[PDB]
């Protein structure tokens, strides 16, 4: 069960690195599948201080774009800092110029350290503000800054847009109060920038006139949009003034629990079903789908209302292992949960469980005040052991009935294993090596697969044990997480959050 | 996975039987352990109508006391109706005389003493019980009825549960509604003076009620060496109605309270004012409770929702055909085994945070600014309409203490159809099941030379009405892995039984 990290190697995840001038050849062990052709692109912090001025929070370091290229069984690695306003102005002024998530500078940040996604024929790196950064997926050059506020009424947008098979992009953002769903169309014949055709399609109400919830991701199915309103609130009174940073504006609402919300995607209409449950933080939706008259909502939850980001200051993450474990003792507990939301609410069933599906223990109780109280079916739960950074076979099973999810396992917040979960049987598979700290696993299907898990997962692994290559790209068979290959590099790679595989 | 019962054999669980004049010899297959010497005593309903007048609810049929005797590898079976007021008066008047849980009798208030639920020791005596103020002294050897005892003659309660805890010295603890609070009753071991320990009954501590005028239904409670745990659910008894109605008619569900959990210091006899709160569930059976550093570990068989589960347990529903049984259970609360963890040391400096600092659990307890402590469980077992119920452990040695194993009856849309074992630390399970076979609660008996917690057997009474077979049997499974050790078959039907005990001789 309990794996230990006394050597403290995970500190290398949070150590500054230098960008490269051109790609390095990675040394391959095992055999890279010959059908694997394209680029794994991932974003993370890469510079954790400017001179003698430190960044304090996990989400503050300057965005670094990484690329592993796969061709004919060979692999290269490359990385470049993203030339954001934050980064450029810091390099020019030799200090911290723009305030970051948890570091006040002594102007909204555009430090796009979180994810990269396609819009039309373009790729954008992002954080969670109004600024996204167009980047070149081949050379990793920075192209331009885009301000979503030039196009739509939001104050920010998540780093987790959903992307439909035709290239339509959906996202959600706070609007200072409601939450707006933005839709960006596929590239059209006119060839003009799809972002100039952005529109707000539906709006979700807020539980508190003046305190919107923090929102990190959302759910999408062919017919519905799902939004989970958590008790982690942004105190706008503090937000809109001023020595404050973003972290300083968050607070937890102790009494509201979680409110869940659905909208009809095609009719562009909020549905006034008052789904309610107990408090949790939520970062990542796993998948969402329709099953008879119900939505199945699979979530990576953190049990409690205290904001989990409070545990993610770099000083805490760089502590020695005994201290890391002790610091996490009172944190919210991670748990994968399936919630089931009834769409057809009959008053005649007031007082009863509406979840009549045969295959779940999730419940939904219709109350006399018309709230629908939910209880989850727990899919995975281990003590301070999170199944996080979830990924699925997204292109073919996103928004649809599915069986398999892949995740990064966090041990008291330290990433130390890769996991696969069968969401129907609760069976799990694990890949782990001592002193090895992987990243979010990304699934790539065999191009001719008919099965759900016929493919590989890719993860970037830091391995700072002194007799070893410092980092490598790991390739696992998706069926059972057995190792297929590694591509080793001779330089460190810091933590990365999210990314994508771009087939070529 | 989903096992089906199209033949409808479970209906035999709810079919009247005749008592026996003396014990029958049961036919043994396999090997009865030679160290197993004593009597399995169990209670259930055995007469489900009086003439043409039907009883309507699972908890209404007249109490039948069953006994399987084990000696030198041989087994006998015997049963006798308990001669309660309810039964005797019904036999005399040839009608339903006393109102039962879910059956109004038609012509002060005569409370039922139909002791169909359990049997337990007090001093050197054995009492059959239901959940009212009346318990019935019975002879564990002949199954004769000795006396009715009215607990109200001795202590201030309106009823007491069928699940008293019994300490190793014979001290009995129980809880009961007092019309409003909940009282813990303590009955001492038999003393030198030899007088009836019930005459020395006392109330040792009282739990407050969430609603001035509506006490919760209480079925069981938790006990450790130092604490008593009481779970106040949203299933309420509407006293306005209570004081053509039956008991079922007086229940209602409180939609907004959720579950309140309560602790008392057992040795100092005082209520602890920690406001533990969580989401709504029905609870019948505590599994086990224990102390772990500054926390209580509270393992429960829960039913997710506030609707009263007993609504699903009318005989007309339980006797339906299988497709209808499944359909009827679709909107019922879902069963789930949950571990709750209750912090005993509440520091204000931790307001807003999770107080459960133990290394081995995902249960949480959040201290709020209003001083409520909001709990979330660690789920130990969960299957769709598949309950791990009627839990039993190695009670004599692990009751109230750190433990690893529980045994249960598995309910499939309320139909008992399998026996289960759960490792509460690893969540591993083991299952025994045969087609068209409907078991009872499994009771654990330790091997005399046991080294480990699960060195022993479980005993269960199984109905097997498949037409090419003996109609019922006593099943013995090895507790290590639930593999079958023996059966003792009888040629007569045995209806459903709820609870019981093994009395070593
Ligand atoms: N992925 C973790 C958080 C990070 O993306 C981040 C870094 C910096 C600012 C920020 O702001 C989030 C707020 C943007 C405006 C609307 C409210 C949320 C969020
Ligand atoms: N085990 C299922 C319920 C059954 O024992 C039963 C049968 C008949 C009456 C009754 O009453 C419960 C109430 C008694 C008075 C105090 C409140 C509970 C309970
Ligand atoms: C690979 C990260 C390891 C260190 C931090 C792990 C703690 C993660 C807590 C839950 C997810 C937080 C959100 C990060 C992803 C994102 O920014 O989009
Ligand atoms: C062996 C019982 C089979 C038929 C009834 C099964 C439904 C049980 C529901 C949960 C337990 C309810 C309480 C019964 C125990 C008791 O009366 O002491
Ligand atoms: Fe994320
Ligand atoms: Fe019971």
């Amino acid at each position: 069960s309990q794996v230990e990290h006394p050597a403290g190697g995970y500190k290398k995840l949070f150590e500054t690195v230098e960008e490269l001038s051109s790609p390095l050849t990675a040394h391959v062990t095992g055999r890279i599948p010959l059908w694997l052709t394209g680029s794994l692109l991932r974003c993370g912090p890469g510079l954790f201080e400017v001179g003698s001025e430190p960044f304090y929070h996990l989400f503050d370091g300057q965005a670094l774009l990484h690329k592993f290229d796969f061709k004919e069984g060979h692999v290269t690695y490359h990385r470049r800092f993203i030339r954001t306003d934050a980064y450029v102005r810091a390099m020019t002024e030799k200090r911290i110029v723009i305030t970051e998530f948890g570091t006040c500078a002594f102007e909204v940040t555009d430090n796009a350290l979180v994810n990269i996604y396609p819009v039309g024929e373009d790729y954008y790196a992002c954080t969670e503000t109004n600024f996204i950064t167009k980047v070149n997926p081949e050379t990793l050059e920075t192209i331009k800054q885009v301000d979503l506020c030039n196009y739509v009424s939001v104050n920010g947008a998540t780093a987790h847009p959903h992307i439909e098979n035709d290239g339509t992009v959906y996202n959600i953002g706070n609007c200072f109060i409601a939450y707006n769903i933005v839709k960006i169309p596929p590239l059209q014949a006119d060839k003009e920038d799809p972002i100039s055709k952005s529109e707000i399609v539906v709006q979700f109400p807020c539980s508190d006139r003046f305190k919107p919830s923090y929102v990190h991701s959302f759910g999408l199915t062919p017919n519905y949009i799902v939004f989970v309103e958590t008790p982690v609130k942004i105190n706008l009174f503090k937000f809109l003034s001023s020595g404050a940073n973003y972290m300083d504006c968050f607070e937890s609402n102790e009494t509201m629990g979680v409110w869940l919300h659905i909208a009809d995607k095609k009719r562009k209409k909020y549905i006034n079903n008052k789904y309610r449950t107990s408090p949790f933080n939520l970062f990542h939706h796993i998948n969402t789908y329709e099953d008879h008259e119900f939505l199945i909502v699979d979530l990576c939850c953190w049990k409690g209302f205290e904001f989990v980001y409070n545990y993610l200051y770099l000083a805490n993450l760089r502590e020695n292992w005994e201290e890391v474990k002790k610091n996490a003792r009172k944190a919210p507990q991670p748990e994968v949960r399936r919630y089931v939301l009834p769409l057809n609410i009959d008053k005649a069933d007031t007082g009863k469980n509406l979840v009549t599906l045969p295959n779940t223990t999730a419940t939904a109780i219709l109350c006399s005040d018309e709230t629908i109280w939910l209880e989850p079916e727990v899919l995975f739960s281990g003590p301070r052991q999170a199944f996080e950074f979830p990924q699925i076979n997204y292109q073919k099973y996103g928004g649809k009935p599915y069986t398999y999810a892949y995740g990064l396992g966090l041990n008291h917040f330290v990433p130390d294993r890769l996991c696969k979960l069968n969401v129907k049987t609760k069976e799990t598979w694990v890949w782990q090596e001592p002193d090895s700290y992987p990243s979010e696993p990304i699934f790539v299907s065999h191009p001719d697969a008919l099965e759900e898990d016929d493919g590989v997962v890719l993860s970037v692994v830091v391995s700072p044990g002194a007799g070893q290559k410092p980092a490598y790209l790991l390739i696992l068979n998706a069926k059972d997480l057995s190792e297929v290959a590694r591509a080793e590099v001779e330089i460190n790679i810091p933590v990365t959050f999210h990314g994508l595989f771009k087939k070529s």
Side-chain angles (χ1 to χ4, degrees), chain A residues 1-176 178-504:
Chain A
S1 54
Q2 175 67 81
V3 179
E4 314 288 353
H5 300 294
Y10 52 80
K11 292 166 206 195
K12 291 281 178 160
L13 296 163
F14 316 117
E15 188 178 83
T16 293
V17 291
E18 298 185 295
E19 71 190 350
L20 292 166
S21 39
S22 65
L24 294 173
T25 292
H27 172 68
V28 173
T29 69
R31 165 167 177 77
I32 306 284
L34 293 179
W35 52 261
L36 191 63
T37 306
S39 302
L40 175 72
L41 299 168
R42 290 182 66 70
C43 299
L47 178 68
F48 299 88
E49 60 291 307
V50 180
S52 67
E53 293 178 9
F55 287 115
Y56 294 112
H57 201 268
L58 179 60
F59 302 132
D60 295 348
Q62 299 295 293
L64 183 57
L65 181 62
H66 306 254
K67 175 168 65 64
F68 284 92
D69 271 352
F70 302 83
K71 201 189 78 169
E72 293 178 4
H74 293 77
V75 182
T76 66
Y77 173 66
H78 189 26
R79 47 157 178 250
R80 301 290 295 179
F81 287 94
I82 304 187
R83 267 57 180 185
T84 55
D85 285 355
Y87 182 75
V88 163
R89 297 183 64 184
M91 288 310 91
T92 296
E93 304 197 29
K94 312 198 164 281
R95 59 185 196 94
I96 298 179
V97 178
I98 301 282
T99 287
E100 303 286 357
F101 188 68
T103 303
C104 192
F106 292 114
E107 279 151 4
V108 175
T109 182
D110 66 334
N111 176 12
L113 80 160
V114 184
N115 201 7
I116 176 167
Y117 58 94
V119 174
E121 297 176 317
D122 306 315
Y123 286 82
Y124 291 86
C126 65
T127 170
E128 296 176 4
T129 65
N130 58 299
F131 298 120
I132 62 178
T133 301
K134 191 176 165 175
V135 298
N136 187 310
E138 270 79 74
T139 65
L140 313 187
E141 293 161 309
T142 303
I143 298 173
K144 67 152 184 274
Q145 185 193 84
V146 171
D147 182 349
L148 296 167
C149 296
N150 286 358
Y151 303 96
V152 284
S153 176
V154 290
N155 286 87
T158 79
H160 295 292
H162 277 288
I163 306 198
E164 290 180 332
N165 282 333
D166 68 2
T168 306
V169 186
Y170 281 89
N171 208 346
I172 190 169
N174 299 280
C175 170
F176 307 153
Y179 316 90
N180 284 339
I181 299 296
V182 181
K183 184 187 186 186
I184 308 170
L187 187 64
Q188 302 300 321
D190 45 47
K191 283 294 196 178
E192 54 217 348
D193 179 3
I195 292 163
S196 60
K197 301 177 197 303
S198 296
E199 50 174 341
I200 300 312
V201 295
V202 72
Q203 170 171 121
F204 285 103
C206 187
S207 61
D208 185 314
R209 192 173 193 181
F210 304 126
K211 302 186 176 158
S213 299
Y214 177 67
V215 58
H216 190 84
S217 70
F218 69 108
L220 185 67
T221 70
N223 300 303
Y224 297 95
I225 299 166
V226 179
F227 163 53
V228 178
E229 195 177 23
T230 67
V232 177
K233 297 298 209 175
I234 298 162
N235 186 320
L236 281 186
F237 303 124
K238 306 182 222 140
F239 199 65
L240 299 166
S241 53
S242 88
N245 61 33
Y246 299 79
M247 273 295 282
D248 297 322
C249 301
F250 290 95
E251 61 181 41
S252 292
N253 178 312
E254 303 197 353
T255 53
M256 66 172 287
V258 169
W259 293 21
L260 300 81
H261 298 278
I262 67 174
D264 183 323
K265 188 195 123 217
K266 291 170 171 162
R267 302 179 183 79
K268 302 178 194 194
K269 194 138 184 60
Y270 182 62
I271 304 168
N272 193 17
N273 290 345
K274 289 178 328 179
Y275 306 105
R276 298 287 179 273
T277 197
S278 57
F280 56 84
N281 292 214
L282 169 68
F283 306 97
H284 300 116
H285 282 261
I286 302 171
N287 197 26
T288 314
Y289 67 92
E290 298 158 34
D291 185 351
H292 295 78
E293 283 276 307
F294 300 89
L295 289 168
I296 310 314
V297 178
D298 291 344
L299 305 178
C300 293
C301 301
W302 291 86
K303 294 155 65 168
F305 50 71
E306 185 188 18
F307 196 20
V308 169
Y309 288 3
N310 297 354
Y311 294 84
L312 304 180
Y313 284 92
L314 300 166
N316 300 122
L317 297 172
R318 288 163 172 156
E319 298 228 56
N320 286 309
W321 178 239
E322 290 298 321
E323 289 62 50
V324 168
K325 291 192 305 197
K326 181 174 175 164
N327 291 339
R329 276 170 335 131
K330 300 172 179 164
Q333 285 274 1
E335 184 165 280
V336 180
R337 294 175 164 178
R338 168 164 290 187
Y339 288 93
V340 179
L341 285 53
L343 297 168
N344 205 28
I345 316 304
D346 180 7
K347 281 270 182 152
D349 292 328
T350 296
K352 300 182 169 180
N353 171 30
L354 308 185
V355 177
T356 55
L357 298 173
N359 60 310
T360 184
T361 56
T363 58
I365 312 309
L366 180 56
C367 298
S368 296
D369 68 359
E370 303 191 306
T371 59
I372 297 116
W373 181 263
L374 311 180
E375 302 275 332
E377 177 178 357
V378 173
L379 308 180
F380 177 69
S381 198
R384 312 176 172 84
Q385 302 305 311
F387 182 99
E388 260 289 358
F389 295 88
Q391 287 290 318
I392 57 163
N393 182 346
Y394 183 85
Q395 202 178 38
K396 186 178 179 189
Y397 296 78
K400 290 188 188 102
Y402 82 117
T403 303
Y404 303 111
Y406 309 90
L408 182 60
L410 313 177
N411 185 352
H412 299 76
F413 304 113
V414 173
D416 76 351
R417 63 199 70 167
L418 295 167
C419 304
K420 176 187 191 189
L421 172 67
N422 180 317
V423 301
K424 298 187 191 281
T425 66
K426 312 185 185 40
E427 181 175 5
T428 61
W429 295 257
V430 179
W431 179 92
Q432 179 163 222
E433 279 193 3
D435 308 301
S436 300
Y437 307 94
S439 70
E440 170 194 63
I442 280 171
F443 177 82
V444 186
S445 186
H446 187 293
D448 307 315
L450 297 178
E451 301 169 337
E452 183 179 347
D453 58 345
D454 180 12
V456 297
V457 300
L458 310 176
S459 182
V460 184
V461 181
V462 179
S463 52
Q468 286 142 66
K469 301 284 189 259
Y472 59 92
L473 178 292
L474 176 65
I475 308 197
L476 306 180
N477 182 333
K479 283 281 170 202
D480 61 357
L481 299 193
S482 57
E483 179 177 338
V484 168
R486 312 180 174 199
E488 303 164 325
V489 302
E490 309 234 78
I491 54 177
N492 189 39
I493 304 181
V495 64
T496 52
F497 299 128
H498 301 287
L500 60 75
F501 188 76
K502 175 179 175 288
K503 294 158 332 196
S504 77

